[PDB]
Design a protein around this motif. Structure first.
Motif, PDB file in Angstrom:
ATOM      1  N   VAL C  72       6.261  61.369 -13.157  1.00  0.00           N
ATOM      2  CA  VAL C  72       6.217  59.906 -13.114  1.00  0.00           C
ATOM      3  C   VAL C  72       4.940  59.377 -13.810  1.00  0.00           C
ATOM      4  CG1 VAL C  72       6.180  57.861 -11.638  1.00  0.00           C
ATOM      5  CG2 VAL C  72       7.780  59.725 -11.150  1.00  0.00           C
ATOM      6  N   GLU C  94      12.648  61.497  -9.113  1.00  0.00           N
ATOM      7  CA  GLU C  94      11.457  60.639  -9.041  1.00  0.00           C
ATOM      8  C   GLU C  94      11.359  59.744 -10.268  1.00  0.00           C
ATOM      9  OE1 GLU C  94      11.492  64.048  -8.606  1.00  0.00           O
ATOM     10  OE2 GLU C  94      10.206  64.638  -6.915  1.00  0.00           O
ATOM     11  N   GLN C  97      14.198  57.033 -10.030  1.00  0.00           N
ATOM     12  CA  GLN C  97      13.765  55.930  -9.153  1.00  0.00           C
ATOM     13  C   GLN C  97      12.735  54.988  -9.757  1.00  0.00           C
ATOM     14  OE1 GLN C  97      15.422  55.076  -6.436  1.00  0.00           O
ATOM     15  NE2 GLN C  97      16.715  56.792  -7.174  1.00  0.00           N
TER      16      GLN C  97
END
Lengths: 202, 202, 202, 202
Positions: C72, C94, C97
């Motif tokens: 991320v 991750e 999202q």
């Protein structure tokens, strides 16, 4: 309506078999191969049950009837189990009358001019011609002269080589037994396809 | 019992189709040709209804399940409509759990050793291998070393030329889609017969 | 819109390089040769800076994204520097999202039916298929059966000889790395032209 | 150190066998033929005992580990019996964590970019690639682009004809099972010699 279905589909599978299971599998084979008119003969064991268990195929547009009907008792069972039409090898006055009162289409079998005339006097103009292999297209052509308004559905020996001659003679539809129905399910479904194509082809 | 049926029949028809009517006709074709394990995929429109309308074939010994199951909602509908087994292309923990509580056989699809191990940890030892045409018999043979007690049912590209190689590699059964199911009812019933004979033949 | 751009342009240059300068020169080469979708992989040193320094090409209609995004933190830097889309070799929950909250298009890579299904459950229907040279068009064709509504963008080994097979299998676009991007600027600009013509040609 | 041993020796014998005695004899054969890295798979009966009884070979410089480790319970037994490294066909988070706390080298197997990335997130950069015969050197070369710092040890189908291609693709070492280990002790010791020479030869 009964007339109109014969006219449209042109072929009725005459289904003889040694068991309920074989009869049902062959009726499915034939339907899957494009034959919508299915005649369950009463030489099939528990022919009654077979017609009842095929009743759902009516929802897919199959027209299930009974053949080799030789008494009114058999006729009653067939109708009770959902037969949409009754066929016999012979002309039966008692079955004619029962089917008239019950409002169910009956196609008696005939082999002679005298039998033909008796059937007409009982109100029939669509006749099973049986046995077709004995009397042939010749018989159908001969009847056109004196009885222009009678139409035949021959049963007996109709096959891939002669089906078009029969239609040339002036038949309304053909009833096909062993040439269509004998063999395994797979072979029957395939022969079903061939007959539809051969008939379309003429 | 689920294991034992796969073991006995060795072939599952994976039925994709564009309509309810096509799906039912192909399921009948396949059954008439000797294939008892029939997987109605959820890419079939109203796959639910198709499984319910084929429920009677269970009385003739057909085993009707559902495939391409990708959510628990689809899984519920399939089971509600009489599915005797659930198949998915992937490993779904949520579907695994639902099928465990419901007491219905679930065969998840797997493609890797890690996926395989996760499926084993969820209690599965019979796995769909998908897509078989990518990973091949080679994959099945490779898994025998480290995972002697896992058995595969490959789906994807299984055909008449390679079905015996798959069985040589050690598969439990094969799932056959387009090689079996594509074409007309008549062609499908016939291809069904060929696969049974070819499988018996090895 | 992200879908629609892939659909229209059909090719994304997957740009690996040893320096900022090489990466920028190759991105210009590719654009000058007709490739509008440009993926700056995070294996490029200071991939961040490269995306920012190419930001002006957006005014000429280039669509600059980031690839080989594996955390991320990398995803944040790419978006902060103007990336219009994020690509990874794997499926990262991750990153999924983060990109969902940030409103940026994410194309995760997948290699198996189980990975595919997980990605769909995370809201994705356009998937990177990686490595394409391992799984091939065969995999793309196999997925059409159970997952008719998933579309793939294969990366890995796509070249001048096989690009049309990939499109025959049903892919949405292709991601081309070394076959396009390796060589000098001049060679890259030229290979860019060839791919556009070869793709148009099918 | 674990990395450095793989780097130096380049080959790990993946030892499957039907008995303790066969496994020990093959491990000696392989060592006598120059293979120092020996992986006792947990498909060997009493694989535990085999590792313990080979513990003395450590004094001769053998490095004895365990393979086909699929639960933490198996992992504990292997470590308790002197395993210097743990290998599995799949990526196991629970085994990763246990080996991290215990301070023992774990090489999980992976087959996809997503699996690879998950393993990296768990701290692994040396990965078993399994099954190598499915995914091939092609897969190893494809991973070099996006994941330049991951190194693979393929297991599955590595043999005398392809071992050099694998090293050309960029693998760190190879795991060799049946091509090395199948046959009698004498044949195994000899095949061991051939692999060392063939590997040196490239």
């Amino acid at each position: 309506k009964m007339e109109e279905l014969f006219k449209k589909h042109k072929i009725v599978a005459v289904l003889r078999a040694n068991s309920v299971e074989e009869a049902k599998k062959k009726a499915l084979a034939v339907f899957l191969g494009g034959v919508h008119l299915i005649e369950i003969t009463f030489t099939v064991p528990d022919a009654d049950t077979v017609i009842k268990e095929l009743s759902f195929l009516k929802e897919m547009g199959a027209i299930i009837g009974a053949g080799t009907v030789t008494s009114v008792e058999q006729c009653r069972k067939a109708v009770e189990s959902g037969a949409e039409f009754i066929v016999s090898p012979h002309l039966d006055e008692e079955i004619s009358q029962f089917c008239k009162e019950k409002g169910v289409f009956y196609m008696p079998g005939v082999m002679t001019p005298t039998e033909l005339v008796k059937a007409m006097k009982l109100g029939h103009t669509i006749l099973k011609l049986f046995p077709g292999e004995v009397v042939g297209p010749q018989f159908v052509k001969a009847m056109k002269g004196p009885f222009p308004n009678v139409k035949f559905v021959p049963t007996g020996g109709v096959n891939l080589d002669n089906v078009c001659e029969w239609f040339k003679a002036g038949v309304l539809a053909v009833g096909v037994g062993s040439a269509l129905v004998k063999g395994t399910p797979v072979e029957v479904a395939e022969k079903a396809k061939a007959f539809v194509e051969k008939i379309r082809g003429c």
